[PDB]
């Protein structure tokens, strides 16, 4: 409920809505295991993948942004 | 049993002088040695009169006497490298005295020191003193500020000094003070916290510090 | 001779003797073994010795250390007690380290016990320190405070020079000559 | 001869003798076995010896180490105790290493204990280290601080040169000549 | 002759004798079996011997190793203890390996025990290493630091040349001539 | 004759004798059976023998192997212990194999112990190896490092030539002539 | 029983000179040897008067005396390679004295040193001293800054130094100091968390420009 925002595109809106949930995301990250979270984060994708390398994204984004469906059962 | 035979094997560690008051004066170089000597007398091993003396104690006693009879005399320190003929350094600018007055002063000092045959008065330059202080601070590459007052100079050394700096400064200050004393030039060492580490800031005429995004601090 | 005190420990006896000698009172120390030491003085000095024993509150109490309130021979230790013992040992180790510096004769150190709360739920507060020390005569106290502050600052995770208090003093005159015996 | 102290340990007796000799007081050490060592002096020197025993607070208390507060023989240990023992053993092994460097006579080292944190859901604070050392005469102290800092920096996962305090001092003059005997 | 020390171990005795001989003090070692070794000197040298024993804090402490804080005799083990024992055994095996290099007389090595965090959840940190060594006279120290760094780098999963500190020193002058006997 | 050391074992005794003979000190080894071996020298050589015993830190304490911390003979074992024993056996078997190559007199090998993490869930990390070896005089060291690297590379599932460090040295001059007896 | 017979088997380690004050002076090379000698005297094995001396102690003592009677004399060091004829190095540019004054100075030094037969005064060049200092730094390829003052030169070596650099630096400095002393040229070695090793630059529309020297330094984010 914040009347000063403005958007231009589906991406710019997605980002702002995701940013809204970080308050909850942080709580789940605090109280759950990093490695089980990472395992499910792999399992959502890697049935797609032709490759073994995981470094391909440097951690600083993905460590902050595990998905909520990955966080829930791990919590 | 002479006194020299009672002070130890290291004969030259101590120096015995006769005083006109019929008393022996033992000259020592430091506190530890002073107490090594004083124990012998306080035990009462020797039957005649004797006394133990050192340069810092004598400087203090003489300054206390000057405080009473010459409360406006400007001077530095008295050197006792040759205990029979001390050297007294006076300021050339901050005093005016005639030769007669200087002689009278000389004789009264000689009366205070019954072990000295004469006192040599030498006039020293304040500009020289101040210059040797500043040159030494520069040679040591310490950061400093200089303040001038009518009767003295003050060097302030303040900030987040390092261990190597603290050590160098301490050594230097202690070297200077043993030559010139602490009457004309004073040094002040002041450790304080660092505000800039990890903060963005603007410096120059209009400086300020970013405490955090959205918070501006303006210093005086 | 009149009896002043009985059943003293060795370190209590020597403190009493030292304080009496300073005021020109000749005293005698006697050992009775399992009964400890006894102190005696002459009649002409009895009055003075009594008044000084009162004024200094001799003999001295034993030395207090916080670890004595939370002895490790106990079946349960709270997170409060363990933390207290820890701090009460660090204090003593710092005092013993300062006594090795050049010129220092003795010292004492005090630390802020935040452990008087668990620090449960609340985040921890910053640490505060205080120290006292005695120096040999002819020491530049002003120039020696810096070293102590520098040394203490880095012994803890978060300390500011503003939060460190240091007080220094010089040794008193030496008591070398013996007191005179009553006529 | 008058008795100063009884029931001393070997190291205590030798420290007391060293301090008396420095001030020109001739003392004698006697061994009674199960009863320990005794120290005696002549009457003319008794007063002075008392005053120095007071001023230095002799005999010395034993050396304090943090592992003493958490005896490993316990049937139960928290993580806090284990972590404490660990740090208190690393401090000792570093002082034993520094004593082997060229010219060092002794050293003392302190580490920032942060084991008082539970580290629950919480980032670890950085480490802080402090050191004291004594050197042989004629050593360029200024140029020797660098070596120590370099050596200490890599002994821990995260240390900054800014967070390391080092204080150095030289050995005092040697006491080689014997004290004079009272006449 | 005056007694300096009693009940020494063999390795304590030989270190004391070495330190007295260096300063021209002739000393004698006596064996009492179950009572250990005793050290004695002449009166003219007693004062000096006392001063040196104080200055060097003799007799030496026994050598610490971290495995001593977590005996394998423990009734139970946590992961922290096992990991500690492991690291404390690797340090010793590396020092024993370095002594086999050409010219090295002795060395000491230290490791980052990051185990103090049991790595519950948190990822591991990289290792840091420190080493000291003593060389035979006439060794090009500058050219020999490279070999040590090269050797240590590959002993661990992740080490950078930047994270390895090495300090080297030469052996002191040889003590070959015997001390003079008091007249 | 003066006693240097008592209660030695066979390997410590032969090590001391070797080091003393190298410096021209004639020594004698005596066997007391259940009491072990004793080493003795003449008085003119006592001083030197003491100085070298200190400088080399003799006698040598025995060789450390990582399996000694997690002794296989136990009622219980855990994955960390099993994995440790395994690696500590491969290390020894490789050193024993290298000593069979042509010209090698002795060698030592080290492996990166990744077991200090469980490697459960966390992905396992690649291996690093280090080797030291001593050669007979007149050996082309440069041409012989290649063979060692080639041999070591294939002993593990994933090793890169970049991750293998090898340091070689030649045997010192032979000590064949006997030392002279004091006049 | 002469003194030489009491000092040991290694006769060559020490040198015994007769002093005009009726006292034996034992010249030593280092602290360890100095104490090896002093123990003999302090035990009291020798009955006549004797004293132990070395070059560093004597340099200190003489400088303390100069501080009192010649508080403005610019000088380097006194060398005792040949203890009967010491060599005293004075600056050429910073001093100004006549031959007569130099002779008087010579005689007063000789009066302070009763074991020396004469003192030779030699004039040295400051530019030479400073040049040799900078040449040795470049020869080691140490990173450094130079600062000049009326009375002296200061070389600063600071930042994230490497082990090999630290070793070379300490060796060089210790070699130089023994020749020229520490009066004219100073070396300051300080470790900082600064990867640039004291260089500093500011960025602007034309590119980088070098900063001036200063106390402030930017800790390396890397």
XYZ file of N, CA, C and O in Angstrom, chain A residues 33-35, chain E residues 121-123:
24
model
N 17.926 -25.567 6.545
C 19.228 -26.029 6.075
C 19.579 -25.616 4.652
O 18.862 -25.932 3.691
N 20.759 -25.010 4.529
C 21.258 -24.551 3.242
C 21.401 -25.678 2.233
O 21.061 -25.508 1.059
N 21.857 -26.849 2.664
C 22.145 -27.867 1.664
C 20.899 -28.580 1.182
O 20.795 -28.911 0.000
N 25.441 -25.894 9.047
C 24.904 -25.008 8.031
C 25.940 -24.189 7.283
O 26.002 -24.224 6.051
N 26.765 -23.457 8.017
C 27.700 -22.532 7.395
C 28.737 -23.271 6.550
O 29.188 -24.358 6.928
N 29.124 -22.721 5.403
C 30.149 -23.352 4.575
C 31.517 -23.214 5.216
O 31.713 -22.369 6.100
